[PDB]
Amino acid sequence: SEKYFVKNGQPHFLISGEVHYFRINPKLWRNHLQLLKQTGADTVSTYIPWDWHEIEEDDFDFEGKTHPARNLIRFIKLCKEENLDLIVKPGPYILAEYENQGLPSWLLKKLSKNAFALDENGNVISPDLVSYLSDEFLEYTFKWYDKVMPIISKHQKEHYGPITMMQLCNEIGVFQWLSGKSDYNPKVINLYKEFIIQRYKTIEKLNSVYSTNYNSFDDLKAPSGKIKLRSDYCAYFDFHLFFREYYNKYISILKNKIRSFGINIKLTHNIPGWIYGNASELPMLISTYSEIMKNHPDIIFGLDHIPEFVSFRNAHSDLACNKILEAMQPEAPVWAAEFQAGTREHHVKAYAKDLETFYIASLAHGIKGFNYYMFSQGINPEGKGFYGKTFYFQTALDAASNKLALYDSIKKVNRFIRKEQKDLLRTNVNSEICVGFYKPYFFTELISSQLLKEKKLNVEELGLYIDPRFLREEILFNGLLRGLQTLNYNYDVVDLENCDLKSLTAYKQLWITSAEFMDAETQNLLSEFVLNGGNLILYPAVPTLDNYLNRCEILKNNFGIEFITKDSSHKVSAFGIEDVFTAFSKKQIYNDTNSKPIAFTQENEICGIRKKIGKGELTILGFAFGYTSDEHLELIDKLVKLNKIKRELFVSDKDIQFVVRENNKSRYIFFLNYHNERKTFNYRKSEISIAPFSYKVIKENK
Amino acid sequence: SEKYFVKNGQPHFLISGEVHYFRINPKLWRNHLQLLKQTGADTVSTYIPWDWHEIEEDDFDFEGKTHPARNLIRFIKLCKEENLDLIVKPGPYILAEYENQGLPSWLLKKLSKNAFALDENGNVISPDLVSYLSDEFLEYTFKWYDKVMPIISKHQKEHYGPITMMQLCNEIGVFQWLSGKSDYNPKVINLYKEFIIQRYKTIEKLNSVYSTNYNSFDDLKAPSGKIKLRSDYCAYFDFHLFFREYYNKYISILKNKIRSFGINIKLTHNIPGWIYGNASELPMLISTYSEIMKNHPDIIFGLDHIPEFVSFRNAHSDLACNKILEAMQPEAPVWAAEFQAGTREHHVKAYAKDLETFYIASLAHGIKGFNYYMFSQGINPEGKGFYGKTFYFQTALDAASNKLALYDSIKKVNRFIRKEQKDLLRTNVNSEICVGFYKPYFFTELISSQLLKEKKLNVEELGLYIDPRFLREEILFNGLLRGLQTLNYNYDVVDLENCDLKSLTAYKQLWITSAEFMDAETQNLLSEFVLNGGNLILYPAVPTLDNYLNRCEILKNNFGIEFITKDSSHKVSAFGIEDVFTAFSKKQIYNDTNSKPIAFTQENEICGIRKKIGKGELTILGFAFGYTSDEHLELIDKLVKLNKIKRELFVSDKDIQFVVRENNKSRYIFFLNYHNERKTFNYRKSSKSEEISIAPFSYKVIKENK
Ligand SMILES: CCO[C@H]1O[C@H](CO)[C@@H](O)[C@H](O)[C@H]1O
Ligand SMILES: [Ca+2]
């Protein structure tokens, strides 16, 4: 049932370290690889920078003819000699704080204007930002592939070379995330028009959905600027769908080119999203890959985990990310393509004793493999670093292969993983709680994000009060998921799109965090789920609109729900918990015919009900809470207990986090202390001391 | 010449604890006070909530007639019986996570619309946010003062009562900041129009400064929306100056009302600005008090310190805040009106082992007094909690008066303070580095802030490239001040406004982080500083404009500088350090005349020079760096060493922070480990080494006699 990497027909914990040959003295390449191997790591990972090897147009150096660190062939041979598999990442973009994000200077100087990403006025966004589907860009990329891919092909495991996986490009769409700016290159906009014509067929159909007044598709302009009208919201929503298709078109062109060289190894991509040590934005980035993940079961997405520290401040981020990736990519192992080792930023410290606990928490939280990024520090050759001379700090090895504090922590964790991997990889958590992932709430990287300074989405201007980003970040990510993890309740996430009703019936509860909009398919799915016997928890709104904000009241009608939206005090009472602070003055006040009122405004109006519908159960809360008080944990705890869901253990100290992972034969209990306090506690099924910011793992035979 | 509190002609370290009588069972008030006193605390501090005591309009209960915890009179009497002095804080605002920020429900229901703070459209910003100078608001505030101030007056120290200090209102302007919006109430707009007429006298004089074409003062409207023209920037700048006068008018009215009751105790106010465990925006909030601190030498401002954790992520916030308060308020002790104890937010943990280190680091960083907030947890009675029933978590005492983990941390810190206060309060650090505080760069809370929704200031649209908020946050607060603390170089901060030259002359170096604009007074001051023998470090720009962005080339001319602004790679070389990453493509390129070139662009163009001018030294860097790489600390270290400034200690681990505080009698060495690593190191005085092991996120204090 578990998904995991495999070696010699047995479960294999992928342990890789990132070592950038192009940033290390070649005299020390062997020493880096030997020290990596000696930690118990089985794989080494690097970019192959296009700028580094195509030194001028049509002049390629893979053998160290012009600089000894351009000897890619020697580095591959060393990986084989030192019994390490190799992950290669030839771009064309690598980012990696490399000048021009890895693109050659000669390419960027030569490209015509129409090869660049352009703003709505036709101006170049950045001198290093190409348009992904530019003919000229793809032509040069293809010429780079024609030289590097025969080398990669020749050194695959299949040919007793070390190469086992390859990454296509790097964080596709990342530049639109960081800036909040879309590419308005006329070629992109022409592909958007085709997408829209393809989707709606006729201008009449588009006009009926958008409430627009176009006489033809010729009137249609790409959305830009702030959303003022529901028709702007519609146009922006489809612009987001378009970019998901556009990224799939791009990765598909790279993939087919790569396969033409007989490269049959596993292909990968990588998901960014961590900011200042939390990852509440990373699900937005996962959502940009929805079309790739639907159309390429054979490309494995891995996570970029950048916790920076390890405490209760960010304890929930890595589990929520790992669970959401599992939801969106069920047939591949959850792995960290970039797994924090040292720090990209000198002023942002990465302590060995923090990251050691992160590595163990990552096991508790279901990771099946990872690539220490960066295992080895680098020195940028001759000014090629976007920033300073040095690449990463407080790594396992410095650029000269000196061992640093993190080295012994990685060796310790790796020793544990190798000892346990056969059993640990085959373990799962028993989740009786399912939490819905409704991707359209996440489709906002161009209009609402933590990195977008000037917000283009202001839902009050559209006659709405529940912002999808506030809902997904504060109510879902930092609220419900943080609360369940804090309370030591297992949850799974499920992608509600094309979701199998049968998979939902495993669970005792399905939690849906709902805004005022939800498409007909999902409203019908949730109707069927309850009617057939499911227990649904739905807040803060019964939705009444579809994704285009047109009337859609299927769930409301199927459930016999009537409500008025009314202003009251932020505080409500729910299930006899007084003074529950809620996010909004506006709440849904429910008719309680055939219902049991279970939440009340300061004036005692009914803002929550329970109801039997068919064979199932509905709990509807007309108010938004996350986790910003002890009453919020008390409410989550009461809701879970409505369907008699129990934690696996009684642990005497409620601030100890635990995860029970088991299979038929084996149980692992992971105890995690996310607090600056030496804690002593006892546990039983439903007396140990753990240092601050530390862990303990117990094995039980069943 | 340290500033410290004095009790009975001796240095006294003010140790207060916050205990909310209105949130504690009155049967347990005495136990809270006794347990606070047994920590060595000398004072207790509390709000007196208007909403709690004026239970309906003109219905006052201070005696526990309608609820036992309304018995203020009994709480005051218990403070005196348990030998604690009392700080009282009657508002009208208290915030305190109390419903409606402490304002009565009946008042907010009753007030007409023109009592409230309004957006430019004329809509109520928030149903609990009044306009400070609303006539209606002040009429009711005065009726509340008429009832609470006689009680406060009767129980003052001079009448053998326990009351030694009183706070006026609470964090003035904290809602113009957190709401994310400016107050356009017509009382405010009409005071602004008066302020402008008084400032400029004639529409022609205003038009000459703004470059506007108004026919009369009646054509001038309060600025709103984004800054697109330099005239919009000028209007907003004066609007910032006006708000500083407005807050001074508000506090002045409260103070004059208070003094009429025969209240002669020390008056206080409290500075907000921490959020998410950093205080990089606090200097903006303290700048909003510039006119209060000039007009009211008798009102002592204290800091509201909310670190939440204690690590290298926020190590520099408290010291930079303490230094900036000292710059703005040099004639009073640096103290924390609210000094984090426990957590206001259940989900934001406060560990005893973090806060204990914070307390010792605060001592190293020059704090002279503090009020643990919250010493005692409270339970909100009668639904009065803004956000839930429980007020604070992980405090020294729970609401029931049980000791929690933090109680022994506070006892330990207080015991050290009581043993050492006589010498410790008199100790100074030897600062050879002075950093200039140029208040106008901070005057942006209406146009550019971490909290403001709409970014209204885009300097590129004004033909500028150095944003004042970017400069003061990243180049100064997170950059230079962070860098100096990390490198263990002592610095002082000086307010450049009406700054005496003779105060600056004791320093080996003056550091000025400059934008393209600087007033003529400051350009002249820095000119005289160097000509008379001062050593000036100036970056990232020689300014060429004044506060209204009109030509002012005084400092450029006085220093015989010629430059052109040119685009190049972010990377420069400086003092032989290669690949120094700088914030801007644009750099100042200097003529090499009568100077040594010490920084170069990727095209080897000169972007920094050193020269001798009169008796003084000038170092100009035409590029912007904070602390975002190791090259940045190397560069700060090189600049400090130009004048042979030395650290007080050789320490074998560069990641250990230390402060040496000394007087004639005594030397204290504070070691601070802001890192999750057990560190073993050795040290010695710059003029046999001692070995020390320090736990993660911990401290050591060594006392030397002589
Ligand atoms: C208005 C509430 O003010 C609170 O929260 C602010 C943000 O963290 C702090 O800066 C203030 O000191 C605190 O009083
Ligand atoms: Ca009904």
PDB file of N, CA, C and O in Angstrom, chain A residues 276 308 313 346-347 351 354 383 385-389 393 453 482 571 578-579 581 627-628 630-631 674-676, chain B residues 99 276 308 313 346-347 351 354 383 385-389 393 455 482 571 579 581 627-628 630-631 674-676:
ATOM      1  N   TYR A 276      10.589  32.052   4.996  1.00  0.00           N
ATOM      2  CA  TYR A 276      10.895  32.403   6.403  1.00  0.00           C
ATOM      3  C   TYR A 276      10.547  31.220   7.311  1.00  0.00           C
ATOM      4  O   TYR A 276      10.133  31.423   8.464  1.00  0.00           O
ATOM      5  N   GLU A 308      14.408  26.139   8.211  1.00  0.00           N
ATOM      6  CA  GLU A 308      15.321  27.148   8.829  1.00  0.00           C
ATOM      7  C   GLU A 308      15.544  26.896  10.318  1.00  0.00           C
ATOM      8  O   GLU A 308      16.705  27.098  10.757  1.00  0.00           O
ATOM      9  N   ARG A 313       6.707  26.817  16.209  1.00  0.00           N
ATOM     10  CA  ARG A 313       6.382  27.908  15.246  1.00  0.00           C
ATOM     11  C   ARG A 313       6.153  27.362  13.837  1.00  0.00           C
ATOM     12  O   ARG A 313       5.347  27.967  13.071  1.00  0.00           O
ATOM     13  N   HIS A 346      23.646  33.339   5.004  1.00  0.00           N
ATOM     14  CA  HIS A 346      24.622  33.403   6.120  1.00  0.00           C
ATOM     15  C   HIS A 346      23.962  33.880   7.421  1.00  0.00           C
ATOM     16  O   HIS A 346      24.298  33.322   8.515  1.00  0.00           O
ATOM     17  N   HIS A 347      23.053  34.844   7.302  1.00  0.00           N
ATOM     18  CA  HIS A 347      22.367  35.501   8.444  1.00  0.00           C
ATOM     19  C   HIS A 347      21.184  34.667   8.934  1.00  0.00           C
ATOM     20  O   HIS A 347      20.554  35.061   9.936  1.00  0.00           O
ATOM     21  N   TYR A 351      21.137  25.173  12.376  1.00  0.00           N
ATOM     22  CA  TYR A 351      21.834  24.442  13.464  1.00  0.00           C
ATOM     23  C   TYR A 351      21.725  22.954  13.174  1.00  0.00           C
ATOM     24  O   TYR A 351      20.604  22.483  12.897  1.00  0.00           O
ATOM     25  N   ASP A 354      18.994  21.377  15.268  1.00  0.00           N
ATOM     26  CA  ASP A 354      17.629  21.626  14.716  1.00  0.00           C
ATOM     27  C   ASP A 354      17.387  20.656  13.555  1.00  0.00           C
ATOM     28  O   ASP A 354      16.350  19.958  13.538  1.00  0.00           O
ATOM     29  N   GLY A 383      33.080  34.756 -10.365  1.00  0.00           N
ATOM     30  CA  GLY A 383      31.937  35.691 -10.327  1.00  0.00           C
ATOM     31  C   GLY A 383      30.605  35.110 -10.795  1.00  0.00           C
ATOM     32  O   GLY A 383      29.666  35.907 -10.913  1.00  0.00           O
ATOM     33  N   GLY A 385      28.404  33.460  -9.282  1.00  0.00           N
ATOM     34  CA  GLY A 385      27.358  33.460  -8.245  1.00  0.00           C
ATOM     35  C   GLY A 385      26.457  34.675  -8.384  1.00  0.00           C
ATOM     36  O   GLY A 385      26.997  35.796  -8.498  1.00  0.00           O
ATOM     37  N   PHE A 386      25.139  34.503  -8.333  1.00  0.00           N
ATOM     38  CA  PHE A 386      24.209  35.659  -8.310  1.00  0.00           C
ATOM     39  C   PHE A 386      24.560  36.564  -7.118  1.00  0.00           C
ATOM     40  O   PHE A 386      24.549  37.781  -7.278  1.00  0.00           O
ATOM     41  N   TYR A 387      24.901  35.991  -5.964  1.00  0.00           N
ATOM     42  CA  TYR A 387      25.206  36.730  -4.713  1.00  0.00           C
ATOM     43  C   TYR A 387      26.725  36.710  -4.508  1.00  0.00           C
ATOM     44  O   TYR A 387      27.463  36.959  -5.471  1.00  0.00           O
ATOM     45  N   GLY A 388      27.188  36.412  -3.315  1.00  0.00           N
ATOM     46  CA  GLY A 388      28.623  36.403  -2.985  1.00  0.00           C
ATOM     47  C   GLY A 388      29.434  35.279  -3.643  1.00  0.00           C
ATOM     48  O   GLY A 388      29.018  34.668  -4.634  1.00  0.00           O
ATOM     49  N   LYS A 389      30.630  35.085  -3.118  1.00  0.00           N
ATOM     50  CA  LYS A 389      31.585  34.051  -3.547  1.00  0.00           C
ATOM     51  C   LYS A 389      31.088  32.675  -3.100  1.00  0.00           C
ATOM     52  O   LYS A 389      31.293  31.695  -3.848  1.00  0.00           O
ATOM     53  N   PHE A 393      26.080  27.740   3.669  1.00  0.00           N
ATOM     54  CA  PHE A 393      26.881  27.775   4.924  1.00  0.00           C
ATOM     55  C   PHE A 393      26.381  26.678   5.867  1.00  0.00           C
ATOM     56  O   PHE A 393      25.212  26.275   5.715  1.00  0.00           O
ATOM     57  N   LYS A 453       3.039  41.768  -3.278  1.00  0.00           N
ATOM     58  CA  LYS A 453       2.944  42.952  -2.381  1.00  0.00           C
ATOM     59  C   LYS A 453       1.543  43.556  -2.553  1.00  0.00           C
ATOM     60  O   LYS A 453       0.780  43.604  -1.568  1.00  0.00           O
ATOM     61  N   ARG A 482      -2.709  22.333  11.518  1.00  0.00           N
ATOM     62  CA  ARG A 482      -1.853  22.604  12.703  1.00  0.00           C
ATOM     63  C   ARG A 482      -2.540  22.034  13.948  1.00  0.00           C
ATOM     64  O   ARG A 482      -1.855  21.378  14.786  1.00  0.00           O
ATOM     65  N   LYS A 571     -17.013  36.614  18.509  1.00  0.00           N
ATOM     66  CA  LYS A 571     -17.058  35.450  19.418  1.00  0.00           C
ATOM     67  C   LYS A 571     -18.388  34.711  19.275  1.00  0.00           C
ATOM     68  O   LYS A 571     -19.427  35.366  19.279  1.00  0.00           O
ATOM     69  N   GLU A 578     -17.533  28.413  25.327  1.00  0.00           N
ATOM     70  CA  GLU A 578     -17.801  29.870  25.273  1.00  0.00           C
ATOM     71  C   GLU A 578     -16.605  30.595  24.662  1.00  0.00           C
ATOM     72  O   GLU A 578     -15.465  30.110  24.792  1.00  0.00           O
ATOM     73  N   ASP A 579     -16.859  31.763  24.075  1.00  0.00           N
ATOM     74  CA  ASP A 579     -15.811  32.717  23.645  1.00  0.00           C
ATOM     75  C   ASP A 579     -14.879  32.051  22.637  1.00  0.00           C
ATOM     76  O   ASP A 579     -13.649  32.138  22.780  1.00  0.00           O
ATOM     77  N   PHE A 581     -13.338  32.675  19.299  1.00  0.00           N
ATOM     78  CA  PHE A 581     -13.076  33.846  18.434  1.00  0.00           C
ATOM     79  C   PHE A 581     -13.153  33.416  16.965  1.00  0.00           C
ATOM     80  O   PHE A 581     -12.503  32.427  16.558  1.00  0.00           O
ATOM     81  N   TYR A 627      -6.470  28.322  14.413  1.00  0.00           N
ATOM     82  CA  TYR A 627      -5.894  27.954  15.721  1.00  0.00           C
ATOM     83  C   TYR A 627      -5.141  29.176  16.245  1.00  0.00           C
ATOM     84  O   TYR A 627      -3.939  29.357  15.950  1.00  0.00           O
ATOM     85  N   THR A 628      -5.854  30.021  16.975  1.00  0.00           N
ATOM     86  CA  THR A 628      -5.276  31.236  17.603  1.00  0.00           C
ATOM     87  C   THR A 628      -5.708  31.375  19.066  1.00  0.00           C
ATOM     88  O   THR A 628      -5.422  32.423  19.637  1.00  0.00           O
ATOM     89  N   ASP A 630      -6.808  28.536  22.788  1.00  0.00           N
ATOM     90  CA  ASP A 630      -7.025  27.190  23.375  1.00  0.00           C
ATOM     91  C   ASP A 630      -8.464  26.750  23.052  1.00  0.00           C
ATOM     92  O   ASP A 630      -8.674  25.553  22.863  1.00  0.00           O
ATOM     93  N   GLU A 631      -9.415  27.679  22.924  1.00  0.00           N
ATOM     94  CA  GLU A 631     -10.811  27.308  22.573  1.00  0.00           C
ATOM     95  C   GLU A 631     -10.817  26.646  21.176  1.00  0.00           C
ATOM     96  O   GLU A 631     -11.625  25.775  20.945  1.00  0.00           O
ATOM     97  N   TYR A 674       8.949  19.869  20.225  1.00  0.00           N
ATOM     98  CA  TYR A 674       9.117  21.092  19.413  1.00  0.00           C
ATOM     99  C   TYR A 674       9.312  22.313  20.330  1.00  0.00           C
ATOM    100  O   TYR A 674       9.224  23.420  19.832  1.00  0.00           O
ATOM    101  N   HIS A 675       9.670  22.115  21.596  1.00  0.00           N
ATOM    102  CA  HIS A 675       9.613  23.184  22.625  1.00  0.00           C
ATOM    103  C   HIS A 675      10.993  23.358  23.249  1.00  0.00           C
ATOM    104  O   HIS A 675      11.703  22.369  23.312  1.00  0.00           O
ATOM    105  N   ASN A 676      11.325  24.567  23.699  1.00  0.00           N
ATOM    106  CA  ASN A 676      12.593  24.835  24.419  1.00  0.00           C
ATOM    107  C   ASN A 676      12.394  24.494  25.914  1.00  0.00           C
ATOM    108  O   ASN A 676      12.385  25.397  26.777  1.00  0.00           O
TER     109      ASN A 676
ATOM    110  N   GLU B  99     -12.241  43.333  25.430  1.00  0.00           N
ATOM    111  CA  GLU B  99     -13.293  43.716  24.447  1.00  0.00           C
ATOM    112  C   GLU B  99     -13.271  45.230  24.195  1.00  0.00           C
ATOM    113  O   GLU B  99     -13.223  46.020  25.171  1.00  0.00           O
ATOM    114  N   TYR B 276       5.568  39.255  15.398  1.00  0.00           N
ATOM    115  CA  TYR B 276       6.183  37.994  14.941  1.00  0.00           C
ATOM    116  C   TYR B 276       7.606  37.847  15.491  1.00  0.00           C
ATOM    117  O   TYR B 276       8.381  37.122  14.876  1.00  0.00           O
ATOM    118  N   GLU B 308       9.091  36.770  21.695  1.00  0.00           N
ATOM    119  CA  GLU B 308       8.402  35.459  21.442  1.00  0.00           C
ATOM    120  C   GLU B 308       9.381  34.269  21.507  1.00  0.00           C
ATOM    121  O   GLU B 308       8.965  33.191  21.861  1.00  0.00           O
ATOM    122  N   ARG B 313      17.815  34.834  15.045  1.00  0.00           N
ATOM    123  CA  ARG B 313      16.756  35.425  14.166  1.00  0.00           C
ATOM    124  C   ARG B 313      16.322  36.788  14.707  1.00  0.00           C
ATOM    125  O   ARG B 313      15.962  37.671  13.893  1.00  0.00           O
ATOM    126  N   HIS B 346      -1.974  31.542  22.535  1.00  0.00           N
ATOM    127  CA  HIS B 346      -1.782  30.128  22.931  1.00  0.00           C
ATOM    128  C   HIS B 346      -0.836  29.406  21.953  1.00  0.00           C
ATOM    129  O   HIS B 346       0.040  28.587  22.388  1.00  0.00           O
ATOM    130  N   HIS B 347      -0.978  29.719  20.681  1.00  0.00           N
ATOM    131  CA  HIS B 347      -0.267  29.022  19.561  1.00  0.00           C
ATOM    132  C   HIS B 347       1.157  29.578  19.363  1.00  0.00           C
ATOM    133  O   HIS B 347       1.867  29.074  18.488  1.00  0.00           O
ATOM    134  N   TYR B 351       8.786  30.083  26.110  1.00  0.00           N
ATOM    135  CA  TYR B 351       9.545  29.149  26.970  1.00  0.00           C
ATOM    136  C   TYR B 351      10.301  29.944  28.029  1.00  0.00           C
ATOM    137  O   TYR B 351      10.920  30.952  27.705  1.00  0.00           O
ATOM    138  N   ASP B 354      13.872  30.402  27.067  1.00  0.00           N
ATOM    139  CA  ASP B 354      14.065  31.560  26.166  1.00  0.00           C
ATOM    140  C   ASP B 354      14.018  32.878  26.959  1.00  0.00           C
ATOM    141  O   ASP B 354      14.942  33.728  26.874  1.00  0.00           O
ATOM    142  N   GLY B 383     -17.392  37.587  29.739  1.00  0.00           N
ATOM    143  CA  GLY B 383     -17.105  37.674  28.289  1.00  0.00           C
ATOM    144  C   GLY B 383     -16.180  38.838  27.847  1.00  0.00           C
ATOM    145  O   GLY B 383     -16.212  39.194  26.671  1.00  0.00           O
ATOM    146  N   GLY B 385     -12.944  39.077  27.299  1.00  0.00           N
ATOM    147  CA  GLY B 385     -11.740  38.720  26.532  1.00  0.00           C
ATOM    148  C   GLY B 385     -11.965  39.043  25.075  1.00  0.00           C
ATOM    149  O   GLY B 385     -12.991  38.607  24.540  1.00  0.00           O
ATOM    150  N   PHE B 386     -11.078  39.792  24.431  1.00  0.00           N
ATOM    151  CA  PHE B 386     -11.217  40.101  22.983  1.00  0.00           C
ATOM    152  C   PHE B 386     -11.255  38.786  22.173  1.00  0.00           C
ATOM    153  O   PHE B 386     -12.049  38.691  21.229  1.00  0.00           O
ATOM    154  N   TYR B 387     -10.425  37.807  22.529  1.00  0.00           N
ATOM    155  CA  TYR B 387     -10.033  36.659  21.667  1.00  0.00           C
ATOM    156  C   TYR B 387     -10.301  35.286  22.302  1.00  0.00           C
ATOM    157  O   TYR B 387     -10.005  34.250  21.663  1.00  0.00           O
ATOM    158  N   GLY B 388     -10.832  35.250  23.508  1.00  0.00           N
ATOM    159  CA  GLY B 388     -11.049  33.988  24.235  1.00  0.00           C
ATOM    160  C   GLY B 388     -11.102  34.254  25.724  1.00  0.00           C
ATOM    161  O   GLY B 388     -11.004  35.446  26.086  1.00  0.00           O
ATOM    162  N   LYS B 389     -11.312  33.224  26.550  1.00  0.00           N
ATOM    163  CA  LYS B 389     -11.574  33.399  28.007  1.00  0.00           C
ATOM    164  C   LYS B 389     -10.273  33.609  28.778  1.00  0.00           C
ATOM    165  O   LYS B 389     -10.311  34.291  29.799  1.00  0.00           O
ATOM    166  N   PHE B 393      -0.711  32.973  28.710  1.00  0.00           N
ATOM    167  CA  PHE B 393      -0.322  31.584  29.007  1.00  0.00           C
ATOM    168  C   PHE B 393       1.156  31.545  29.333  1.00  0.00           C
ATOM    169  O   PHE B 393       1.894  32.438  28.868  1.00  0.00           O
ATOM    170  N   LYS B 455       0.697  49.907  -0.632  1.00  0.00           N
ATOM    171  CA  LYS B 455       2.014  50.601  -0.727  1.00  0.00           C
ATOM    172  C   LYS B 455       1.850  51.903  -1.531  1.00  0.00           C
ATOM    173  O   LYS B 455       1.620  51.838  -2.757  1.00  0.00           O
ATOM    174  N   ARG B 482      22.582  45.108  13.219  1.00  0.00           N
ATOM    175  CA  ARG B 482      22.680  43.629  13.364  1.00  0.00           C
ATOM    176  C   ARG B 482      24.149  43.204  13.228  1.00  0.00           C
ATOM    177  O   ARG B 482      24.625  42.376  14.043  1.00  0.00           O
ATOM    178  N   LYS B 571      27.225  43.196  -7.794  1.00  0.00           N
ATOM    179  CA  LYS B 571      28.458  42.842  -7.066  1.00  0.00           C
ATOM    180  C   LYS B 571      29.501  43.938  -7.253  1.00  0.00           C
ATOM    181  O   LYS B 571      29.731  44.357  -8.379  1.00  0.00           O
ATOM    182  N   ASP B 579      33.155  40.354  -4.731  1.00  0.00           N
ATOM    183  CA  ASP B 579      31.790  39.780  -4.828  1.00  0.00           C
ATOM    184  C   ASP B 579      30.989  40.207  -3.590  1.00  0.00           C
ATOM    185  O   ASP B 579      30.328  39.360  -2.948  1.00  0.00           O
ATOM    186  N   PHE B 581      27.829  41.596  -2.576  1.00  0.00           N
ATOM    187  CA  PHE B 581      26.501  41.771  -3.194  1.00  0.00           C
ATOM    188  C   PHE B 581      25.871  43.053  -2.625  1.00  0.00           C
ATOM    189  O   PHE B 581      25.713  43.169  -1.407  1.00  0.00           O
ATOM    190  N   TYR B 627      23.153  43.027   5.923  1.00  0.00           N
ATOM    191  CA  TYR B 627      23.837  41.807   6.390  1.00  0.00           C
ATOM    192  C   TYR B 627      23.048  40.617   5.845  1.00  0.00           C
ATOM    193  O   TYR B 627      22.139  40.099   6.520  1.00  0.00           O
ATOM    194  N   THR B 628      23.390  40.210   4.621  1.00  0.00           N
ATOM    195  CA  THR B 628      22.751  39.087   3.905  1.00  0.00           C
ATOM    196  C   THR B 628      23.812  38.158   3.304  1.00  0.00           C
ATOM    197  O   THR B 628      23.414  37.274   2.526  1.00  0.00           O
ATOM    198  N   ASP B 630      28.335  36.718   4.181  1.00  0.00           N
ATOM    199  CA  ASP B 630      29.553  36.813   5.019  1.00  0.00           C
ATOM    200  C   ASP B 630      30.388  38.028   4.559  1.00  0.00           C
ATOM    201  O   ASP B 630      31.089  38.612   5.401  1.00  0.00           O
ATOM    202  N   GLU B 631      30.329  38.404   3.276  1.00  0.00           N
ATOM    203  CA  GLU B 631      31.143  39.528   2.732  1.00  0.00           C
ATOM    204  C   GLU B 631      30.702  40.788   3.478  1.00  0.00           C
ATOM    205  O   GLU B 631      31.543  41.630   3.777  1.00  0.00           O
ATOM    206  N   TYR B 674      22.994  32.771  21.252  1.00  0.00           N
ATOM    207  CA  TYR B 674      21.707  32.879  20.539  1.00  0.00           C
ATOM    208  C   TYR B 674      21.534  31.704  19.556  1.00  0.00           C
ATOM    209  O   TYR B 674      20.689  31.776  18.604  1.00  0.00           O
ATOM    210  N   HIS B 675      22.248  30.594  19.777  1.00  0.00           N
ATOM    211  CA  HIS B 675      22.376  29.507  18.766  1.00  0.00           C
ATOM    212  C   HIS B 675      22.006  28.165  19.392  1.00  0.00           C
ATOM    213  O   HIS B 675      22.185  28.021  20.581  1.00  0.00           O
ATOM    214  N   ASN B 676      21.476  27.234  18.601  1.00  0.00           N
ATOM    215  CA  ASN B 676      21.094  25.907  19.146  1.00  0.00           C
ATOM    216  C   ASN B 676      22.314  24.999  19.039  1.00  0.00           C
ATOM    217  O   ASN B 676      22.356  24.094  18.187  1.00  0.00           O
TER     218      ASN B 676
END
